[PDB]
Design a protein around this ligand. Structure first.
Ligand SMILES: CCc1nc(COC)c(-c2cc3c(=O)n(C)cc(-c4cc(C(C)(C)O)ccc4Oc4c(C)cc(F)cc4C)c3o2)[nH]1
Length: 107
């Protein structure tokens, strides 16, 4: 019933497994991909890699701080990219699944 435990062992596990996870398993390396304007446009970057770490290393005060970061990851992608881009359809897919798993969240 500890919610952070649930986010790690169940929510993050399911999303990490998913077909479309791989572009979100690590920070967007703006240099390698030649994105000069990314860290200017996106104020608080986020990826499942960093969320994973933060859950493992007892960083989050509570589950709501963690769920905020997941949402930042999605909105970040929807901000920087054009709608109907492939990257977006992938984040949208992940988000749907994320919100299903958050509804079975133990109280
Ligand atoms: C190369 C210039 C560029 N255009 C875009 C948007 O088009 C999909 C991006 C872009 C945006 C964007 C993004 O928002 N996220 C979260 C992740 C990527 C991305 C990241 C990486 C790595 C693993 C190196 O970090 C690899 C591929 C990424 O995006 C894709 C994807 C997902 C599919 C593609 F066909 C081509 C790219 C560039 C990523 O790439 N970059």
């Amino acid at each position: 019933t500890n919610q952070l435990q649930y986010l790690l062992r169940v929510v993050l596990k399911t999303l990490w497994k998913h077909q479309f996870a791989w572009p979100f398993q690590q920070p967007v390396d703006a240099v390698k991909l030649n994105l000069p304007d990314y860290y200017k446009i996106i104020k608080t970057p986020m990826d499942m890699g960093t969320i994973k770490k933060r859950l493992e290393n007892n960083y989050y005060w509570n589950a709501q701080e963690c769920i905020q970061d997941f949402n930042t990851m999605f909105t970040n992608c929807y901000i920087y990219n054009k709608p109907g881009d492939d990257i977006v359809l992938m984040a949208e897919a992940l988000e749907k699944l994320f919100l299903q798993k958050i509804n079975e969240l133990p109280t």
